[PDB]
Paper text:
HHV-6B [name] is a tegument protein essential for viral propagation, and additionally it interacts with host factors such as tumor suppressor p53 and cellular protein EDD, thereby regulating host cell responses. HHV-6B [name] is a tegument protein that is 604 amino acid residues in length. [name] belongs to the herpes pp85 superfamily that is shared among beta herpesviruses, and has no homologs in alpha and gamma herpesvirus. The N-terminal domain of [name] ([name]-NTD) adopts an elongated, helix-rich fold without any significant overall similarity to known structures.
The structures of native [name]-NTD and the SeMet-derivative were determined at 1.85 Å and 2.3 å resolutions, respectively. There were two almost identical [name]-NTD molecules in the asymmetric unit. Almost all of the [name]-NTD residues were assigned to the electron density, with the exception of N-terminal residues 1–7 and C-terminal residues 456–458, indicating that the designed [name]-NTD represents an actual structural domain of [name]. [name]-NTD has an elongated helix-rich structure composed of sixteen α helices, four 310 helices and two β strands. To facilitate structure description, the [name]-NTD structure was divided into four subdomains (SDs) based on secondary structure topology and spatial arrangement. In the crystal structure, a dimer is formed along the long axis of [name]-NTD in an antiparallel orientation. The calculated buried surface area per monomer is 4146 Å2 (red), which is a relatively large value compared with those of known homodimer structures of similar size, at approximately 2800 Å2. One noticeable characteristic of the [name]-NTD dimer is an internal cavity within the dimer interface. Broadly spanning electrostatic interactions contribute to the dimerization. The HHV-6B [name] structure suggests multiple structural features as potential function sites, such as the negatively- and positively-charged clusters, the β hairpin flanked by the hydrophobic patch, and the grooves formed along the dimer interface.
Residue numbers in the entry:
A (entry chain B), B (entry chain A): 8 to 455
Amino acid sequence: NIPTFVLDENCNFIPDVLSRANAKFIKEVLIRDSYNAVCLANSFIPMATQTVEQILIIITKFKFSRSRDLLMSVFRLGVHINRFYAGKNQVKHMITMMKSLFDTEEAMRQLDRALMGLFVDARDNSYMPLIALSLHENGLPDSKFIKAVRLIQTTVNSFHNRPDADIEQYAEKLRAYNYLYKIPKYTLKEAVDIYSDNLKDLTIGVNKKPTLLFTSSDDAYLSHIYNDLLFLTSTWNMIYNCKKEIRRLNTWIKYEINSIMETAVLVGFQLPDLKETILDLAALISNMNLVSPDKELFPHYKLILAKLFEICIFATKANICILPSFIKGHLIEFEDVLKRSNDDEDLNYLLLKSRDSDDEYDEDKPPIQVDPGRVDNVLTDSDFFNVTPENAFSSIAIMPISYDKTIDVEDNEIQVLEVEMQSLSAVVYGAVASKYGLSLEQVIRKLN
Amino acid sequence: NIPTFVLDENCNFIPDVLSRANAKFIKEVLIRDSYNAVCLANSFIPMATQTVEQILIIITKFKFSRSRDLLMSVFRLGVHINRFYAGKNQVKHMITMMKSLFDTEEAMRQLDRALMGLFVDARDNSYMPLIALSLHENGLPDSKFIKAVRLIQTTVNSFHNRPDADIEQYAEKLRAYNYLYKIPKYTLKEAVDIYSDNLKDLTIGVNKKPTLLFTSSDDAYLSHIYNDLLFLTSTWNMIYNCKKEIRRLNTWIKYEINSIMETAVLVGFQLPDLKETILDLAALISNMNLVSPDKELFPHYKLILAKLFEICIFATKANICILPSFIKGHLIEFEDVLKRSNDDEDLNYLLLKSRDSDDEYDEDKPPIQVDPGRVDNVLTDSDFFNVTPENAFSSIAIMPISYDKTIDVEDNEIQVLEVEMQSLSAVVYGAVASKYGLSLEQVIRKLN
């Protein structure tokens, strides 16, 4: 389904948005079909946010399937940010090009004359505010676009409308370079050919004013203006919806960025070497949230995405299984076991194999991993945890981690219990203790 | 790459876990490569949780990509629940089979005799705690298993060890029906063939006592015991880890189920006809959470999985774009706009275009969708929302919805601001109002 003209060596990431190195990382980790889908979803073609999501399928090669959960979130975010940035620059140029059609009195009077010609039998003068005065970036939201097109369509009894056979199928090419564009009911293939070039030009950002039929000749006057107005209104509606979709991307991005902070902290539980990277990430997101409501956030997006790719690359090279949901589930279990634990039971007993465990063979004495009275710390498993000796005894990056537990329903309101987890660091300390054969007290004693 | 024996028409879901209609739904919405991967990930082959995840890729046919976000979470959960159930039943049988090898006094004396023979030159009696007394379901965790195999390996100085040709690559087939099994350094291909059969039977659940080479032959005795002890210890280590992984799945499932409640609520924003289904889901999850620890939760898992599939099937039939992350992002933006608004700006003003908005054409008066002073309510878009007239004036299923906003860092500690969102219901009544040509006031007055 992928058009060859959206193929790109950098997966269509703008240099200002993502580094060459990071763009290469994406090609390294995805299977061919997924890479091609990302190319299309990240391409110059205007599309609604839901269309981006349908196309965007992120599938890693088998090698990197261990860190899919992380890579998917980050890559998705990157596509959103890229479309946001690219989109803004694109619609700006579209506005400049479409505005230039009638930015002189002579061009406006030409349009005035054409409108007068087509609307010669009009019931009233509604074509002025609905069409004539709405050919700008705020002029034609969906609701007003529908009315404008219906009004144009009433003028078919003022000229001999003889649509080309199969013009509907013929005009389908007008979405080749633009999936946001709503194709109106054109009548002339001659007109559609011109609008095809116009729309392609608008997407590419070609420095060439749009062509209209009624300003290229004098022939078949009214049918030419009829099709031209359909083009003008649909294209301005498309431009309006570009601005709307850019707003929708911006809104999503801010939430994706705030929510991924917990993801990064959870990754840092599996790979504590990332501590400084994660804290740097937190500072970047803090600075982003500090900004006044009116301002442009892209510079923050750029830095944040870069920092997120640092985390992905490291996590991928570590070759452990990055499963933030699995880790959080086990942090919850740890707190629950701790909460129900007895008083001849400290964290050392709960988190760590006893030193002479391998001397125990009694079946009624479950070893620690299957003992419901102790903790199966998945971070003692080499597939879920690694740290260098240099960072083994540093504090971890931490933020408040909680989850809401559904406990009742009152009519339409679901009741929950917030479970705040405040002893999380212990499982990481327990992982270090296990790796290096120490007690918890010994590990903690690394106050430094 | 998928083994032939794991291909299945119900995606290897146990009937008691998932209905045949729901298994068919899975087959309907996934592409073939994804369906086959799910078949393997959901198969009787013992695997570590991380191995399951590496294999489990959920890819929808393009027709269903609109709801991929929901389907991915529910199907993943389903596989986890299935593996938990199947796994518990399977390891119980494995234990019964392996236990039956030495459950009579005559069988025990034969083993003791075998043991003394092989360990004739042992330098202590550690073969008793490490091996003889650890042939049970709690006997051989990884740390002990390593020591046990190392001890067995020392006995090659007590017999003529001439390992078969090409045995270590030949033994590779012992993981065909078991990916959790650790393959030890066997020496005899006659041994490996017996163990291949044993392991295949164990995974399938064949009511047939395993075979040992030293109790089935006479020839070259000591090398037979040597291989048999490697089989016994590795198989019991595998059984122990089965128990461990079952516990890991159970831990993960509880968190997936609690977290998906919010996902379901968000889907209900887009599809309020699901309100009663969502409130029933909350009651099921509440019941599950009520259960004292640690009882068997599968009856609850079963019901909850079936209720989630109801949500999936309805959302998919609806053919709208189900993006909980996107929706939550826009709930957050609505809150912010609401907070920034003044007393001249009521919800009706913030959420709905004015009556005569399509008469307005001034460029310097941005229409509602691109006006930063008002809300672009994505639920007025037919791609994101639908409801039947019968449910248009029912209140939505609601739960507390919050997000942590990262605002500062000090040392290793990340500081956040909890943002709890009130008035979320208004975006739905705003969608209803827009859908049916009503004011917000006209909607809210009709609510109970």
